[PDB]
Design an enzyme around this catalytic site. Structure first.
Site, PDB file in Angstrom:
ATOM      1  N   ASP A 139     -22.346  14.419  28.500  1.00  0.00           N
ATOM      2  CA  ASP A 139     -21.490  14.199  27.296  1.00  0.00           C
ATOM      3  C   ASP A 139     -20.632  12.944  27.605  1.00  0.00           C
ATOM      4  O   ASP A 139     -20.775  12.078  28.601  1.00  0.00           O
ATOM      5  CB  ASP A 139     -20.666  15.113  28.354  1.00  0.00           C
ATOM      6  CG  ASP A 139     -20.091  15.954  26.210  1.00  0.00           C
ATOM      7  OD1 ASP A 139     -20.287  15.506  25.389  1.00  0.00           O
ATOM      8  OD2 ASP A 139     -19.195  17.005  26.716  1.00  0.00           O
ATOM      9  N   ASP A 200     -20.483  19.404  17.707  1.00  0.00           N
ATOM     10  CA  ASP A 200     -20.459  20.702  18.413  1.00  0.00           C
ATOM     11  C   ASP A 200     -20.774  21.779  16.889  1.00  0.00           C
ATOM     12  O   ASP A 200     -19.611  22.081  15.879  1.00  0.00           O
ATOM     13  CB  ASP A 200     -19.416  20.669  19.468  1.00  0.00           C
ATOM     14  CG  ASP A 200     -19.273  19.878  20.454  1.00  0.00           C
ATOM     15  OD1 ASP A 200     -20.023  19.191  19.972  1.00  0.00           O
ATOM     16  OD2 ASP A 200     -17.935  20.342  20.575  1.00  0.00           O
TER      17      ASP A 200
HETATM   18  C1  LIG Z   1     -21.736  15.562  21.830  1.00  0.00           C
HETATM   19  C2  LIG Z   1     -21.592  17.167  23.164  1.00  0.00           C
HETATM   20  O1  LIG Z   1     -22.272  16.840  24.275  1.00  0.00           O
HETATM   21  N1  LIG Z   1     -20.497  17.874  22.973  1.00  0.00           N
HETATM   22  C3  LIG Z   1     -20.060  18.791  24.336  1.00  0.00           C
HETATM   23  C4  LIG Z   1     -20.454  20.433  23.581  1.00  0.00           C
HETATM   24  O2  LIG Z   1     -21.481  21.003  23.023  1.00  0.00           O
HETATM   25  C5  LIG Z   1     -20.329  21.133  24.957  1.00  0.00           C
HETATM   26  O3  LIG Z   1     -20.641  20.553  26.340  1.00  0.00           O
HETATM   27  C6  LIG Z   1     -18.408  20.674  24.978  1.00  0.00           C
HETATM   28  C7  LIG Z   1     -18.570  21.409  26.607  1.00  0.00           C
HETATM   29  O4  LIG Z   1     -16.814  20.740  27.258  1.00  0.00           O
HETATM   30  O5  LIG Z   1     -18.312  19.303  25.402  1.00  0.00           O
HETATM   31  C8  LIG Z   1     -18.604  18.334  24.374  1.00  0.00           C
HETATM   32  O6  LIG Z   1     -17.709  18.620  23.175  1.00  0.00           O
END
Ligand SMILES: CC(=O)N[C@@H]1[C@@H](O)[C@@H](O)[C@@H](CO)O[C@@H]1O
Ligand SMILES: *[C@@H]1O[C@H](CO)[C@@H](O[C@@H]2O[C@H](CO)[C@@H](O[C@@H]3O[C@H](CO[C@H]4O[C@H](CO)[C@@H](O)[C@H](O)[C@@H]4O)[C@@H](O)[C@H](O[C@H]4O[C@H](CO)[C@@H](O)[C@H](O)[C@@H]4O)[C@@H]3O)[C@H](O)[C@H]2NC(C)=O)[C@H](O)[C@H]1NC(C)=O
Ligand SMILES: *[C@@H]1O[C@H](CO)[C@@H](O[C@@H]2O[C@H](CO)[C@@H](O[C@@H]3O[C@H](CO[C@H]4O[C@H](CO)[C@@H](O)[C@H](O)[C@@H]4O)[C@@H](O)[C@H](O[C@H]4O[C@H](CO)[C@@H](O)[C@H](O)[C@@H]4O)[C@@H]3O)[C@H](O)[C@H]2NC(C)=O)[C@H](O)[C@H]1NC(C)=O
Ligand SMILES: *[C@@H]1O[C@H](CO[C@@H]2O[C@@H](C)[C@@H](O)[C@@H](O)[C@@H]2O)[C@@H](O[C@@H]2O[C@H](CO)[C@@H](O[C@@H]3O[C@H](CO)[C@@H](O)[C@H](O)[C@@H]3O)[C@H](O)[C@H]2NC(C)=O)[C@H](O)[C@H]1NC(C)=O
Ligand SMILES: *[C@@H]1O[C@H](CO[C@@H]2O[C@@H](C)[C@@H](O)[C@@H](O)[C@@H]2O)[C@@H](O[C@@H]2O[C@H](CO)[C@@H](O)[C@H](O)[C@H]2NC(C)=O)[C@H](O)[C@H]1NC(C)=O
Ligand SMILES: CC(=O)N[C@@H]1[C@@H](O)[C@@H](O)[C@@H](CO)O[C@@H]1O
Ligand SMILES: *[C@@H]1O[C@H](CO)[C@@H](O)[C@H](O)[C@H]1NC(C)=O
Ligand SMILES: *[C@@H]1O[C@H](CO)[C@@H](O)[C@H](O)[C@H]1NC(C)=O
Lengths: 387, 387
Positions: A139, A200
């Site tokens: 992330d 997301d």
């Molecule tokens: C773009 C991306 O990876 N998005 C992630 C989502 O999928 C999830 O992992 C979240 C957890 O805190 O953090 C981010 O918003």
């Protein structure tokens, strides 16, 4: 990413959408982020046909980290993962499955857990390899554009240097608007197995539509960069959860399939209905998703009736057609022909309806056909020449 | 409207949402707007518990009209309604049901069928009474504001003069933006049994939310005007159709109920699932909707957690509470107490969960409770003091 992995889109289960950052195990032991949650899901995947259909990844997302030890080595939450990650990886491996994990290229994870900063990239990479992790989602919360530009290739290199094949899921483009020039898709293809391009997913049809519409608006850019070893990731499947009706559930499955998207579930596999299982375990749908050519499909037609047509090229001169109704009234008789959908030659085709199993034969380019499509729903065809 | 009718919100079935302006009986005889369709729905209402539960209106919507005869007398489509409207009213009455019909105060109906212009108002009213129609939806397409201002009071008067009690549904406010200064709700309450304030509902959760949102933003205006004989009308129930998930279906039912909305279905009663029928035929839900006091409920609370709380006052010092999750992540453990929801002190309460049937007893104002609400879903309480 030329690491031998994900020659087809990854299939499996990811904790985040359904279970989020639920750490209250005292009040909610069955649904909190814990080793128990993952072991039970693994058991379901092994027993209920998931693994045999191709769902092999079982991925931890955010909120797993306890802290860093005296040496700076990441450790899971001791109360929620008492046996440790290596134990979990072993368990997952023994059931014929693969274990994914989550880290953040920045100061903290999006939920504020210890981040993988630039000076921790190598160490964390080696830690995941030592643990026998099979996939990493990286992330990009709490970082600068410069940090991400340095950090994502740094992790790719570090993962490579470990010697262990680890599928690499990069959130990088999502933090950059997902488009050129800020996003360099040529570089991403070289360093990642898949990447989250966009927002997301949330448990709603609106969220599905907003993702679809973004991928379609920019398909001229996004369609060509996908292929064996390097996929666009429009995010998790919602099938089995709360926000989608039946038609909408079947729609996401079909549309993620024509987009050569990862098939990453995020739902309670212990209580999932037969109807939702039937969607996710559709053998022809999976075959289309897992097509060896790995050619992302496209929206090829949009009509004022709000019927959209998507098409994905497949191996053996086969195609996948998705007739998608954005109407919000009632079933719609869509009249078309293969000629009107840019099919050429004097080839005689046959189609199998992916959901009903029905076979339509004697389809020439000029042959008029009707498909009945329900509001916010799809008709999907597996189309092939016959002789 | 002081005609003795609709002292509780009307319950029944309306053709429009599900069947729209489908006039293709040759290709689609089962689903086209026809005599057959109305009789079959009427049989279902009579045989499947609907009538018994209180759903008594079977309402024709647009696209029934064939033309006007030499005397200017309105006629149904001779092919789709071969026996004419009295046959249908007589059939429906023989099943202990009531027949609703549709006209447009303007040149044409919204779908272009013959309109009830100012000079036709009295004649059409007399025709409907002669046909033994029990309810009229007067739409407002293809008219001017002044025509509507004359036309709606004119129709109410003309229906009255027939001597037949005919429930009067007025679309007038929906064409005028639904708000003061253009909409006079004291006027409407005098001339109408119910009125469509806002946009046509479509088969989607987005649509339900936008209607809800509008009603909540303007509840200070809308809540006080509703009462026995004169209701706000947020449009048809979508339960049984394509766009709503189970949670959303339960939510619309609960929310329409706290809003003292009409419970007008628009779905295929021939193929309706047990699960959707269970929502619509919920005895306590109906009892609450049909509460003799007819006090429209309000949204009393909106938390940053995106949990909303609605409260409707009922007879016998009882109340309805709807805990509504606008979250799109996962189930939420909403913590509250009746004191925090502005309930009266020293009283002990008991609550029945409207969907599960479970009884929570011994609730004082200070008593902390937890309700588990699913995303885009509700928990509904029927609450009453106990001695
Ligand atoms: C773009 C991306 O990876 N998005 C992630 C989502 O999928 C999830 O992992 C979240 C957890 O805190 O953090 C981010 O918003
Ligand atoms: C660190 O980074 C390097 C890249 O810099 C990775 O090295 C690559 O690893 C992959 C996967 O192991 C290699 O791809 C495989 O190559 C096999 C042999 O090809 C050789 O021969 C040709 C001759 O033309 C050379 O051009 C080529 O460079 C190789 O030396 C193939 O047999 C494999 O084929 C696969 O697909 C077919 C389908 O057609 C299947 O039938 C096979 O079973 C098989 O799965 C495959 O293509 C690649 O060659 C390596 N690249 C380089 C530049 O060395 C490391 O893997 C990476 N390390 C980690 C741990 O991430
Ligand atoms: C055409 O239009 C006319 C005129 O608007 C309608 O006539 C009205 O009909 C309504 C409903 O039936 C009548 O309302 C009821 O009146 C009952 C008796 O009222 C008498 O006393 C008053 C003065 O106090 C007089 O105005 C009237 O002439 C009567 O002599 C009430 O007992 C009813 O009470 C209801 O509500 C109370 C409390 O809210 C409850 O406790 C009861 O249970 C009950 O439900 C009610 O108010 C009204 O009187 C009529 N008006 C006139 C002027 O005649 C026609 O019905 C309409 N016709 C058609 C076919 O549409
Ligand atoms: C409601 O209906 C009235 C009645 O007229 C009917 O509908 C019309 C659209 C025509 O199809 C008529 O055959 C029919 O009887 C409408 O009033 C009429 O509108 C028409 C169309 O605008 C007028 O004709 C126009 O006249 C002007 C000016 O001379 C020309 O520029 C145009 O080319 C055209 O010929 C007509 O005069 C008028 N008739 C009367 C008696 O008022 C009305 O428009 C309609 N209203 C609404 C709310 O839609
Ligand atoms: C990522 O974190 C770094 C590290 O600094 C942390 O945050 C500081 C505000 C403070 O709480 C320190 O104790 C932490 O270690 C951030 O880099 C710092 O940025 C601040 C500006 O707010 C600056 O004053 C410091 O000099 C920087 N620290 C050093 C020595 O490099 C960085 O800003 C964070 N990235 C983002 C934008 O989230
Ligand atoms: C506000 C209002 O009555 N809306 C109506 C809708 O309910 C339906 O009757 C339709 C038929 O053509 O016409 C209008 O849009
Ligand atoms: C397809 O249907 C249309 C009618 O809409 C007709 O005109 C056409 O001839 C048909 N095509 C063929 C080749 O049968
Ligand atoms: C209700 O719970 C809160 C904590 O959220 C607690 O502080 C409070 O004292 C409780 N009230 C009662 C009367 O139990």
């Amino acid at each position: 990413l030329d690491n031998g992995l994900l020659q087809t889109p990854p299939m499996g289960w990811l904790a985040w959408e359904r279970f989020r950052c639920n750490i209250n195990c005292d009040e909610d032991p069955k649904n909190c982020i814990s080793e128990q949650l993952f072991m039970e899901m693994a058991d379901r995947m092994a027993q209920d046909g998931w693994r045999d259909m191709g769902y092999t990844y079982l991925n931890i997302d955010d909120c797993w980290i306890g802290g860093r030890d005296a040496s700076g080595r990441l450790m899971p939450d001791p109360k929620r993962f008492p046996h440790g990650i290596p134990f979990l990886a072993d368990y997952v491996h023994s059931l014929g499955l693969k274990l994914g994990i989550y880290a953040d290229m920045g100061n903290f994870t999006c939920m504020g857990y210890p981040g993988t900063t630039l000076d921790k990239v190598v160490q964390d990479a080696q830690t995941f390899a030592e643990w026998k992790v099979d996939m990493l989602k990286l992330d990009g919360c709490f970082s600068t554009p410069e940090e991400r530009a340095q950090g994502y290739p740094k992790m790719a290199a570090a993962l490579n240097a470990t010697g262990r094949p680890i599928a690499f899921s990069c959130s990088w483009p999502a933090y950059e608007g997902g488009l050129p020039p800020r996003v360099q898709y040529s570089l991403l293809a070289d360093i990642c197995n898949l990447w989250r391009n966009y927002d997301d997913i949330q448990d709603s049809w609106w969220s599905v539509l907003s993702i679809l519409n973004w991928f379609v608006e920019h398909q001229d850019i996004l369609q060509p960069v996908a292929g064996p070893g390097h996929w666009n990731d429009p995010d998790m499947l919602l099938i089995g959860n709360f926000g989608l009706s039946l038609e909408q559930s079947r729609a996401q499955m079909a549309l993620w399939t024509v987009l050569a998207a990862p098939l990453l579930m995020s739902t309670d596999l212990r209580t999932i209905s037969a109807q939702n299982m039937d969607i996710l375990q559709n053998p022809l749908m999976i075959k289309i998703n897992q097509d060896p050519l790995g050619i992302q499909g496209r929206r090829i037609h949009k009509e004022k009736s709000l019927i959209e047509v998507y098409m994905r090229p497949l191996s053996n001169k086969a195609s996948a057609l998705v007739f998608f109704s954005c109407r919000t009234d009632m079933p719609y008789r869509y009249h078309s022909s293969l000629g009107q959908l840019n099919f050429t030659g004097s080839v005689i085709y046959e189609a199998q309806d992916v959901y009903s199993g029905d076979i339509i034969s004697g389809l020439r380019d000029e042959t008029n056909f009707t498909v009945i499509i329900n509001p916010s729903g799809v008709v999907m065809w597996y189309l092939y020449p016959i002789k």
